Design a protein around this ligand. Structure first.
Ligand code: I7P
Ligand code: I7P
Ligand code: I7P
Ligand code: I7P
Lengths: 614, 614
């Protein structure tokens, strides 16, 4: 009925330019129909010749499209045949080695990677088959549509004479390859059982708009509604009922991290939805499973549940829920519940994503030794902007270990004490390393990448980009320490520090535009100050992001400076609280164009599957 | 991949017994496969003869199923051809009358009914086409499964030799009929335009019933979450913050009706979901549009919004956030909003259902004159159990017009002695008629039906059933009035009243079982105390409903009698509040089996479309 959006939603992204231009043909046909003058205005010969010339040009365009499709199909078939030959040779070598302990574990890894390579090959073959079917359907539908407006029946004859003889339609090699692959997998690997072998080779409609189950959407809406109502109740309770008898700073300073985490989860769900809709293949970049994947609804549901728990804990800290449990227990219960949810060793509640995240975290935090992929440095980049949660963790540990006297009530709020503040300082040393941890991780990753791929431009400069944070933080700490000690030269520690402000931002900002986002290209074309090809439909997004990155970069250096050095102590807490939720927004904007620039490097290579070895 | 639930969900409910028994064939094949004796000593000849006899019986069953399908298709095709001939003759008569004002309005009505009859005929033809396609697919799939499991080449040969030469597959008369119908509608009726005619004749995937849009489910969940959180907050506020000013009785008596309406909407949504899932075709019975329909999610989304408004109004009444607006304004705003939502004359917010409901309400309340259909008496039956809202309406009108002072913001709470008691007495006697209105409507509908049909068994006994409410209410009112007047003979007005209690319930209860639900049949099989065929899978539902109706009938009788007679001082206002939400539950249970018994009168007639006339 509606072929346009069906074709749009069933297109393989990396081959989007290799399909048929249905919409262009439709617009051309409509323009030709409208351009016809009146019967009386022009003679019948002029109308006849106009129709004839338009038909000729239409058929020339159709011939060009058919030739392009045929060439693409032939190249893909040749590539598939060569890959099959290579895989069969490797499988034969592995099986003859197996026929003739550490050797057993090596073999286990061998048939661990081989059964994945075969699955990837099967996915490629299925994608080629779908491409062929969809292209033929589009040709037939556009010719049928043409054969109605013009009322000249020349499209049916053209289809019968040209498309029906096309090799892209008359060849059966893909089906034979599929059958041989199934036979090889069932015989050599799974040893005679078609059930599990077919189960691991099933291709669900991954290249479509497969809706989520209605229960997931219902849960998302339920959690969102409870969250907004609890938020309104919390705001009213804070405004009306509570009096800040002994400050609420050790309360917001503890509850900031959970709010930041929930906001990050929500924005990540939005990011995933945008990637999926815009046509960016993040599954190939992140090296995920094409058949099993997490949609944005699951992330929204997780964020909603976490927000429900956070709001309930804050409300419990607010009024007087239980008259026997001390009020300094609720944040502990909340964070313990978060940790328990993450590291649950059972097989429930997205058990297939939590383990992947845990292994990724281990690899990230063991940076110098493990090899570096896209996911590792992407997660390290996220942790770079998510350091406020680490700061809150350190502050909460030092507040509970030393400052709060557990024997009274109202443990959390009243910090009424003599030396209240021994934790709101920096002089013992541990306030700068906690903030320099992620920069150190990225610096070490860049060093390892340069060592492996010994090409010193991208990585040594990238490694030097993260080193400016060390200089800035150490100079801020030194200036604050000498100000507290009242040295007459403290002001000089101000001066150079200020330049290490600018040298920081102007560094990273440039790397954000030229290298991370790939803008300001010399082949910009019509798109001014951008690159030649853009995925997202509107340039206003690009211009607004360019505008906002500049502003949000400058108020990242100032937040990390004011917060580690802990200076100007009358508005530092409020400014840090205000500026914390802007860092996540900046990173959320950055992710879009970072992954879009990464994706466009796989569109000139026509790569659609994750190539693997044994 | 999974043909079982596809076949189950794509079956026309009224032709379910005329399809192919796929599950029975699967179970038979599995049992035969499991019953393989043994190679051990049994001997190959015994296994061979067992396989041969099973193959023979399998082929006999397949032949019987094929013959049944062929005969059903032949009968349906003959019926369709005769109906087409009749419709063509009527259309020809109408067009020749049109070719050769009140006559113009009559012609407009004629082409109003004709364009509906043609659409229903087109729906029937499309249903027959789908039946043919699905039956062939099922045959092919089951034969392929048999061939796979029993390692032979008999199934393919049998399919080629028998199913291929079947008329249910080689007869293309339906396609010619469909093309002729399109031609006739496009030429004679829509005058040469295929666009609007085809749009009118399009058959959407009803069987698929594509899982409802995600925004609707999201809104349902959002409204539900807000409702539950507001309910918890309201309960806490009522328990804790309330004040012993003067009574909360003129508040529950006002807010009861909205709660009852919301509960009715929720239970009606559950009812619609149950009807759709169980296979009951309520669209045919209610004479709705087979292409445009309301799902249960829309009713849940209306109910959630109404509950949100109700909870907000109650919270505003409790807290009184605004210090200038009087407290007796909020229920007025709530009920005005409900009325405005119902009678909105624009074209938004389910405008094609509200107008249908309004016309139905007009027909119901003008009962003696209009003809009676299923939708009229069904709605009157619902209003019979929904009289508490009418009682609340009359009480609120009397309370505001007479009692309320409006001068000082004492509001909807209190502060009088006898002003509470003129509205709580029955000197006017108006609270008997407000309760006897729906019984009167049903009684007059039964009288009109008996006059139309001239068959006196069902309708002149139904009218007698409905007439007992008048006796019960009038005797309760007389007893209460004489008790207030202190007559020495008032006790006798008690005595006979008590029998008019029993005579009421034992009447209606019997009509609920034998006639409304069609149970206690004389020719039941293994379903003891039930009817021969049942739609809902489990008999436990039937037995539970049989148990429940008995208790709830006496509860309903005593509740309405006590509420009408205004007797038994304080208890007769908490007992009514407790018993009010049980009469909606009783009606909600009654609807299931009422419509199921109605449905099992077209399944034996093989009627799947609604017949009309011009
Ligand atoms: O005039 P248009 O441009 O609006 O065409 C309409 C419609 O014409 P209409 O006005 O009489 O209803 C066609 O119906 P026909 O009369 O040709 O049969 C319909 O084809 P269809 O029913 O599937 O028939 P088959 O393809 O299965 O053979 C086509 O659907 P697509 O080609 O599949 O996208 C639509 O295209 P669209 O613009 O995308 O909605
Ligand atoms: O070799 P291993 O140690 O990796 O484990 C086997 C397999 O064990 P098995 O031999 O008893 O069938 C695991 O199934 P289980 O024992 O947990 O049921 C399965 O885990 P899984 O499906 O993810 O998890 P679950 O859905 O089953 O809970 C894993 O698949 P991957 O981890 O996805 O690659 C398999 O790898 P492979 O040898 O390539 O088939
Ligand atoms: O052994 P079973 O009883 O489980 O059969 C399975 C499956 O066998 P498997 O174990 O090798 O995967 C069949 O695959 P095959 O090897 O015959 O091709 C499959 O057919 P399929 O792929 O659609 O093939 P085509 O019909 O399109 O030609 C069939 O689907 P349905 O007939 O359409 O319902 C399934 O039936 P089910 O029980 O309902 O899930
Ligand atoms: O004859 P009438 O007075 O009953 O009205 C015509 C038509 O008016 P038209 O002649 O200008 O096209 C109405 O469309 P509008 O004027 O409101 O746009 C349409 O209402 P509708 O589609 O429900 O409502 P909307 O979706 O359009 O808002 C109605 O269809 P039905 O009531 O469903 O039977 C039609 O009946 P028919 O003659 O059989 O085609």
């Amino acid at each position: 009925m509606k072929f346009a959006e069906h074709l749009s939603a069933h297109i393989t992204p990396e081959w989007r330019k290799q399909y048929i231009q249905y919409e262009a043909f439709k617009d051309m046909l409509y323009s030709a129909q409208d351009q016809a003058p009146s019967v009386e205005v022009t003679d019948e010969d002029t109308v006849k010749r106009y129709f004839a010339k338009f038909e000729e040009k239409f058929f020339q365009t159709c011939e060009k499209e058919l030739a392009k499709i045929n060439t693409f199909y032939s190249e893909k078939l040749a590539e598939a045949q060569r890959r099959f030959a290579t895989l069969q040779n490797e499988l034969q070598s592995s099986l003859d080695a197996q026929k003739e302990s550490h050797e057993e574990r090596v073999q286990h890894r061998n048939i661990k990677d081989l059964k994945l390579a075969f699955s990837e090959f099967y996915l490629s073959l299925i994608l080629l088959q779908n491409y062929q079917n969809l292209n033929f359907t589009g040709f037939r539908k556009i010719l049928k549509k043409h054969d109605k407006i013009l009322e000249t029946s020349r499209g049916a004859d053209w289809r019968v004479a040209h498309v029906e003889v096309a090799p892209f339609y008359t060849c059966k090699k893909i089906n034979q390859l599929i059958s041989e692959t199934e036979a090889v997998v069932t015989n050599e690997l799974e040893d005679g059982d078609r059930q599990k072998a077919m189960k691991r080779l099933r291709v669900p409609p991954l290249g479509a708009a497969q809706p989520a189950p209605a229960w997931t959407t219902f849960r998302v809406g339920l959690f969102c509604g409870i969250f907004i109502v609890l938020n309104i109740t919390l705001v009213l309770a804070a405004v009306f009922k509570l009096e800040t008898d002994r400050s609420i700073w050790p309360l917001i300073r503890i509850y900031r991290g959970g709010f930041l985490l929930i906001e990050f989860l929500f924005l990540l769900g939005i990011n995933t939805y945008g990637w999926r809709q815009a046509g960016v293949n993040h599954v190939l970049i992140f090296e995920l499973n094409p058949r099993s994947n997490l949609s944005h609804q699951h992330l929204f549901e997780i964020a909603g549940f976490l927000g429900i728990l956070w709001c309930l804990s804050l409300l419990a800290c607010f009024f007087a829920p239980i008259s026997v449990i001390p009020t300094y227990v609720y944040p502990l219960a909340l964070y313990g519940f978060m940790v328990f949810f993450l590291i649950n060793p059972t097989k429930t509640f997205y058990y297939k994503s939590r383990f992947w995240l845990l292994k990724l975290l281990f690899r990230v935090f063991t940076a110098p030794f493990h090899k570096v992929g896209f996911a590792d440095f992407w997660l390290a980049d996220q942790l770079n902007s998510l350091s406020v949660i680490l700061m809150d963790l350190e502050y909460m540990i030092c507040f509970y270990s030393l400052e709060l006297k557990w024997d009274e009530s109202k443990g959390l709020l009243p910090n009424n004490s003599e030396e209240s503040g021994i934790c709101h300082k920096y002089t013992y040393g541990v306030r700068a390393i906690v903030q320099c941890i992620p920069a150190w991780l990225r610096f070490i990753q860049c060093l390892r990448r340069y060592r492996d791929t010994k090409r010193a431009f991208p990585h040594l400069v990238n490694a030097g980009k993260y080193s400016t944070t060390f200089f800035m933080v150490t100079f801020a700490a030194l200036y604050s320490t000498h100000k507290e000690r009242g040295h007459s030269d403290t002001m000089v520690f101000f001066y150079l520090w200020i330049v290490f402000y600018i040298i920081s931002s102007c560094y990273t900002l440039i790397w954000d535009l030229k290298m991370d986002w790939g803008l300001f290209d010399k082949n910009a074309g019509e798109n001014t100050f951008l690159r030649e090809e853009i995925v997202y439909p509107q340039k206003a997004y690009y211009y607004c992001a360019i505008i906002e990155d500049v502003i949000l970069r400058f108020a990242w250096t100032i937040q990390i400076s004011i917060t580690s050095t802990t200076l100007l102590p009358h508005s530092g807490d409020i400014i840090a609280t205000v500026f914390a939720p802007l860092e996540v927004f900046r990173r959320f904007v950055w992710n879009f164009f970072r992954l879009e620039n990464e994706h466009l490097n796989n569109c000139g290579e026509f790569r659609a599957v994750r190539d693997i070895s044994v």
